[PDB]
Design a protein around this ligand. Structure first.
Ligand SMILES: Nc1ncnc2c1ncn2[C@@H]1O[C@H](COP(=O)(O)OP(=O)(O)O)[C@@H](O)[C@H]1O
Ligand SMILES: Nc1ncnc2c1ncn2[C@@H]1O[C@H](COP(=O)(O)OP(=O)(O)O)[C@@H](O)[C@H]1O
Ligand SMILES: Nc1ncnc2c1ncn2[C@@H]1O[C@H](COP(=O)(O)OP(=O)(O)O)[C@@H](O)[C@H]1O
Ligand SMILES: [Mg+2]
Ligand SMILES: [Mg+2]
Ligand SMILES: [Mg+2]
Lengths: 621, 475, 475
């Protein structure tokens, strides 16, 4: 390169670092130790837009720029030390480094796939996970060997391209014709596997150096801004030489459009007079290959909504998710719902159940529950799930954490997953002889499931004809209106409402408390659904219903909806009556039904002081 | 073997052993002695050599030093592929696997193939070294394609279509040794062709399988072990497996039997005797896919099968005065998946036994049940199985049948009187699966005659056959 | 990592891989050339070298010959130990094992450590070779010690001792989330501290264990899975293991769970599901030692554990009209070793549920049963668990309680009326273990208040907690 170019580049970086990076260098100067290591973080877009010439000089030879910036940082530190007013609690350090970040979003610099052979000497950005990890080891850099046959000492260095080997020199750079270890560094070796979510992918062997050692973990998402170079091997006569692709790291990250919003507020601002029309439209687009079955489709959305985790200070943490289980005669559509819900959720694992061994349901290696962190694992054929395995999940289903010390290793892992289940009612189902009798599951397990919906096929002469016409005429989506919704829109909708944190209110909790106190003993209090875990779920479902309607303040409507749904969930013994889930259709007008439901609920449980306020609010809208 | 050395030829096969990538160098540069003028010797096929002479202007050569950093060095990709050659012909009884030859992709290729294809490869044939004058054979690829019937095959299939009674000729030629059992052979013929696949609502699809499943149950000695051998023989891809030498690890993926029977039939014998693998194929046959058997850690593979099973009652001979449920040892889950479960009986008649004895000694020297029976005094010469094999392949990839408005009414009416009648009586519960099965079987009787319609007679012919495991039999 | 090269530092850790002993030479001699004058070149750190020059009187050197028999050569011992660092701080959720640094002992040391210790090592840091410019890090020992609280720790523990009601502030601080269940928390607090170990008759001893064992049995949903988590958290050394993924080789030495939880808590959850490993712990918790599991060929190792277990009745909910033995599915051998077995019931009250619901919705926004409760209207701010963790350590190795004459009379009296009433009534037989357990627990109620006595109310506080699994509950 030209002599003036590097000088101008160094001037640019030193000016930028002196203008925008005084606090960090001041902090770095005021530290103990003399010569260990100290990095500096510098953004790229700002200095790229400050001068147009630096970018062209940078993104063609990404080797000299780092050294020039290191020299600029050194001279800046020297200048600051010279112009210092408190030279007592300060120390001068000879080891500085550079770390650039904030690369543009150009398609050819944010490539997700590993380059084949075309990117050598190009600055790239890759993302992926971690598989293997080596040990901390120390290299030798430079020797300063004894001077032979001459006087001036030699400062020969090592070469990276030859696996850190040393070549014996014989031609001295001496002016005349006469021609004849307290240094340490750091090292590591890591393997990166490309993610499958955004895609079998191959592996990238990344090499770390200096401070980057002991800064990565197995099983985390990484983003490295490194250079791509080639590593050779010693040559053998009359064979095929071997090469490899590596990635020298220069920076690391531990990371783990207004149009979509504007569309969402347009949608939930148009539906202002009628708030339940939006909810009806949301529920209709779920699994639109099935006719009817309002309650189950609402329950699936409520379960998939989620909740918030609330951990106490010292040791304890409570559950913040929900679980669902369905029972019914074969041929009702249980598998369709699981298949459809296995796709909307970003991360989901589909398993057979009885065909899955103990290596998946628990830890062995990662199984199924641990592998589905922050996701949803679907469970099928729960009738005979290998009773040992069927009972060895009580710990991880309620405490969200496994605690195993098999073979004297003492390993602890985290698992937070919503479980969906569907099993056949072995034996001819009866209206009486509650689920604990027909399916014969233990009471401790038949308490952690929030909603248990029962499906029964009975004698009717209308639903059969409607479903026969639906199947035969091939009338996909009988509502020919072009509202629908695409699957990507639903995925974005359910991936965006997970960020809101609703807060409880006073017109709310009183209703749930009175309902729980009333239900704790009416005349039979069932046998297993009247424990303390009932109220712990009545809040998690009422809160989840509030995150599907774009708000963060629970009101009377959410409480009424959740109470009605959960009361309908409890088959047989109840306080209003049981309604079959399958024989339910979308109401033509939801406002009148909501008003009737509120008037029916708020009379026998004495909260009449709220009914007047609610009717006044409903009238004035 | 020997002669085809350095001669351009062409091949055809599949891919099973796609490997990783690793670069290689072909024109890496060398250092120069004395003066400058470096050079870029064309090193051949990745074998290190030395420039014993250098052209240069003048003087001596040598200059034996490597300079593997200059931009003069050029690199390119590499790959390795193994090809297994198809069944083709020469059906020798020996269990010798077909020979395999390796392939090498040079540049701008790679990631153009996936495990399992049908590819045509043309390239030069060279000889490797150091697998010591002991070498092997491998081919350097030059062009790759991706994805055929002869003219005579077409002429034959049009003449076969030209027959006046195509259904009789194909139902009475599957197995001519066995006498009688018209309806079971008709059901097997219907199963061989198959139905259509529905991709409705492309954005989410959730596809539904389009093939039937038939189980045969009856007394021993009726001959229900050769109607299946012939059916397995006449198929583009088939496999026959017993019910005692296989386990859960055998039928499913560990490449199981179901995977090998993709787009074909995987008929299983001695079905009743299984007692531990019953709950291992419900997911596979219904989900139309199978996942990994190691803790269920994704890695799913397609498995399209048309499983055909034959079994005997639990107590040997089946007595006539009991209930049907206890004589099969099957739950309500696995008994409803199958479309047709034929029940056969052995009764001591007079005329039928006489005719059967006459046939079995001579070999060693209107409802849809009589129009198919052969009245003696005519020639019903069967089509060779070799020609019938080439017919199914043409049928299954050039015609996609669909239902018509007229035919759907009959199926709907049948379903309506079936449900309202059997919802009170005691029998297997009738779900919505039977409505889909009737559609699938009506679609099935449209690929045998090479048509794309649904006539009223088409739907009427799937009513009489259905009344052989349903109501027409439970009594 | 890099900077500390050849710099004197100090360490602290545990020893786990004591190795064998093999000698090495440092002052080996060499032969001389021409004339005599054998020399004793200083060979450095066991690396063979050659004396290219010999001082001698005059003339050439060479003399490259070994003479490894003269008494000039000396030999010295050697060893190799690895050290793993303690938990210390930085409680990251990541499961990375602490870094291990090797150690080397030179002379006059060796046989100074055994597997399992707390040692401080000071020595120079050096770099090895030939694990090729690739090396590792190891430390040459210079001095060894064997086996501390800061002054602020003494001040803090003194201030906590200065509390006016020390019992309440520790019984209502183990887990503040759970409402109610005061007696079980008191029992857990008593078990956490422990008692005294009796070495009576030192010449033969036969030591008797000096720690209790607690079991909790009750209906599901009462919260008996977090009071144990909190108890395990506040301990100098604690391990928590489920009862499902562990086998006989897991709990016992195959390094089992019990040996790892030496001098601490090894709480086990889901105790009822175990049906095969029951008979593998009676010896372990009774004899206070465990031998080898390979044919029992000696090789014993200490294991002091304070097992805490929580279990579920066999029939889910526990019915109120049955016998106690059938609702537990436990014999008379594994039911008598435990000192206390709390039985909890779930009944639908009107005030308790009203208060509990208010507490659980607010969190998301005289006999020894009333003096421990907290009435509304005052602050009971708990001690942070970090400070309480360092209090048990001081209370465990600086105070040894001893029974007094006055307190023994009450225990003897209680045992006397217990025996004459268990003679006739039906219950678990009252063996001689009850008196020893009462002595152990009365000793326990002398270590929480940091005292060495046994006064009357100390012994009276143990007759009321005892009446919650005994007679006070059998009805
Ligand atoms: N409302 C409906 N509309 C269309 N098809 C349906 C409907 N209900 C059920 N089905 C059919 O029933 C099948 C569902 O079977 P399913 O009951 O999930 O099996 P399993 O009992 O093994 O879970 C689907 O293939 C679907 O075609
Ligand atoms: N209709 C028939 N014509 C000629 N042979 C028959 C007929 N039915 C049965 N067989 C004879 O019975 C044998 C088949 O026995 P099979 O009934 O398949 O045994 P399994 O009941 O164990 O399957 C064949 O060898 C065949 O010769
Ligand atoms: N007194 C209480 N106060 C607050 N939460 C409670 C109380 N009792 C039980 N819980 C709730 O019950 C859960 C504990 O369940 P638990 O009864 O330990 O299950 P198991 O019976 O299987 O051990 C906790 O998450 C907690 O939130
Ligand atoms: Mg299913
Ligand atoms: Mg057979
Ligand atoms: Mg527990």
């Amino acid at each position: 390169m030209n002599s003036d170019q590097v000088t101008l580049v160094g001037q640019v970086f030193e000016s930028y670092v002196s203008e925008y990076h005084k606090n960090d260098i001041l902090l770095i100067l005021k530290e103990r130790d003399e010569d260990a290591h100290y990095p500096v973080v510098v953004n790229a877009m700002t200095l790229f837009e400050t001068n147009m010439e630096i970018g062209e000089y940078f993104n063609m030879f990404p080797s000299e720029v780092l050294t020039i910036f290191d020299s600029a940082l050194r001279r800046s530190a020297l200048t600051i030390l010279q112009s210092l007013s408190q030279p007592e609690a300060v120390s001068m350090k000879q080891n500085l480094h550079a770390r650039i970040s904030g690369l543009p979003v150009c398609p050819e610099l944010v490539r997700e796939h590993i380059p084949k052979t075309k990117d050598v000497g190009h600055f790239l950005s890759v993302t992926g996970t971690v598989i293997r990890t080596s040990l901390v080891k120390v290299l030798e850099f430079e020797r300063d060997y004894m001077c032979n046959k001459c006087k001036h000492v030699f400062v020969i260095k090592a070469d990276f391209e030859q696996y850190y080997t040393f070549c014996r020199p014989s031609s001295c750079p001496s002016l005349e014709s006469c021609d004849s270890p307290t240094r340490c560094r750091d090292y590591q070796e890591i393997k990166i596997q490309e993610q499958v979510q955004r895609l079998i992918p191959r592996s990238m062997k990344v090499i770390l150096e200096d401070d980057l050692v002991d800064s990565c973990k197995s099983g985390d998402d990484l983003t490295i801004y490194g250079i791509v170079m080639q590593r050779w091997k010693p040559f053998q006569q009359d064979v095929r030489c071997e090469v490899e692709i590596v990635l020298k790291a220069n920076y690391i990250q531990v990371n783990n459009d207004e149009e979509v919003q504007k569309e969402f507020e347009d949608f939930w601002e148009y539906y202002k007079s009628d708030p339940f029309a939006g909810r009806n439209v949301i529920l209709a687009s779920l699994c639109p290959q099935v006719f009817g079955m309002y309650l189950v489709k609402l329950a699936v959305a409520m379960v998939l909504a989620g909740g918030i985790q609330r951990t106490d200070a010292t040791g304890t943490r409570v559950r913040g998710e929900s679980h669902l289980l369905l029972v019914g005669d074969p041929g009702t559509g249980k598998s369709q719902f699981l298949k459809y819900a296995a796709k909307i959720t970003p991360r989901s694992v589909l398993t057979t159940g009885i065909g899955s061994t103990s290596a998946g349901l628990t830890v062995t290696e990662a199984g199924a529950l641990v592998l589905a962190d922050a996701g949803l694992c679907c469970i099928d054929q729960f009738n005979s799930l290998k009773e040992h395995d069927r009972t060895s999940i009580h710990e991880a289903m309620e405490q969200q954490t496994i605690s195993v010390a098999k073979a004297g290793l003492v390993c602890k892992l985290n698992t937070r997953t919503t479980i969906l289940a569907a099993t056949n009612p072995k034996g001819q189902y009866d209206p009486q002889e509650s689920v604990s009798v027909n399916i014969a599951l233990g009471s401790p397990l038949l308490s952690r499931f929030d909603l248990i919906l029962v499906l029964l096929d009975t004698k009717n002469e209308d639903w059969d004809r409607i479903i026969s016409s639906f199947i035969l005429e091939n009338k996909g989506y009988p509502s020919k209106s072009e509202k629908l919704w695409s699957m990507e829109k639903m995925k974005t909708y359910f991936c965006l409402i997970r960020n809101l944190q609703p807060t409880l209110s006073d017109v709310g909790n009183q209703v749930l408390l009175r309902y729980y106190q009333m239900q704790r003993q009416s005349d039979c209090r069932n046998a297993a659904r009247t424990t303390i875990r009932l109220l712990e779920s009545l809040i998690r479902l009422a809160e989840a219903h509030a995150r599907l309607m774009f708000r963060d303040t629970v009101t009377l409507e959410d409480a009424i909806t959740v109470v009605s749904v959960m009361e309908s969930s409890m088959q047989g013994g109840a306080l209003l009556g049981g309604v079959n889930a399958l024989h339910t259709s979308f109401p033509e007008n939801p406002g009148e039904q909501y008003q009737r439901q509120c008037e029916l609920i708020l009379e026998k449980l004495e909260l009449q002081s709220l009914l007047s306020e609610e009717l006044r609010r409903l009238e004035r809208l | 073997r020997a002669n085809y050395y350095g001669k351009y030829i062409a091949l055809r096969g599949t891919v099973v052993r796609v490997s990783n990538i690793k670069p290689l160098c072909t024109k890496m540069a060398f250092l120069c002695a004395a003066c400058g003028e470096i050079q870029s010797f064309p090193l051949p096929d990745g074998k290190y050599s030395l420039p014993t002479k250098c052209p240069v202007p003048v003087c001596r050569g040598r200059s034996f030093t490597a300079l593997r950093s200059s931009p003069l060095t050029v690199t390119m990709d590499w790959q390795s592929i193994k090809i297994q050659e198809l069944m083709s012909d020469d059906q020798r009884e020996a269990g010798r696997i077909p020979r395999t030859i390796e392939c090498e992709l040079v540049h701008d290729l790679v990631d153009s193939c996936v495990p399992g294809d049908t590819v045509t490869i043309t390239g030069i044939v060279k000889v490797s070294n150091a697998e010591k004058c002991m070498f092997l054979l491998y081919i350097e690829a030059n062009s790759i394609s991706n994805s055929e019937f002869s003219l005579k095959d077409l002429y034959a299939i049009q003449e076969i279509q030209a027959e006046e009674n195509l259904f009789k000729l194909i139902v009475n030629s599957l197995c001519p040794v066995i006498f009688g059992h018209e309806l079971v052979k008709a059901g097997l013929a219907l199963a061989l062709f198959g139905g259509s696949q529905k991709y409705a609502d492309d954005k989410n699809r959730i596809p539904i399988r389009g093939d039937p499943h038939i189980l045969v149950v009856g007394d021993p000695g009726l001959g229900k072990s050769q109607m299946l051998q012939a059916a397995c023989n006449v198929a583009p891809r088939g496999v026959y497996v017993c019910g005692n030498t296989t386990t859960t690890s055998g039928l499913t993926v560990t490449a199981g039997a179901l995977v090998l029977g993709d787009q074909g039939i995987c008929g299983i014998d001695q079905f009743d005797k299984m007692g531990n693998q019953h709950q291992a194929l419900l997911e596979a046959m219904e989900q139309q896919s199978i996942s990994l058997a190691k803790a269920g850690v994704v890695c799913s593979l397609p498995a399209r099968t048309s499983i055909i099973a034959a079994a005997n009652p639990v107590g040997g001979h089946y007595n006539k005065a009991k209930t049907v449920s206890e004589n099969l040892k099957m739950g309500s889950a696995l008994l409803s998946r199958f479309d047709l479960v034929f029940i056969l009986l052995d009764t001591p008649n007079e005329h039928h036994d006489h005719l059967l004895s006459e046939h079995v000694i001579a070999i060693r020297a209107k409802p849809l049940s009589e129009r198919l029976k052969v009245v003696p005094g005519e020639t019903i010469d069967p089509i060779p199985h070799q020609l019938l094999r080439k017919y199914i392949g043409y049928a299954r990839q050039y015609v996609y049948p669909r239902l018509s408005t007229e035919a759907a009414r009959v199926l709907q009416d049948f379903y309506l009187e079936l449900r309202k009648q059997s919802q009170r009586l005691n029998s297997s519960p009738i779900t919505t699966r039977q409505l889909e099965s009737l559609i699938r079987l009506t679609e099935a009787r449209a690929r045998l005659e090479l048509r794309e319609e649904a006539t009223k007679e088409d739907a009427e012919d799937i009513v009489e056959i259905m009344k052989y495991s349903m109501l027409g039999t439970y009594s």
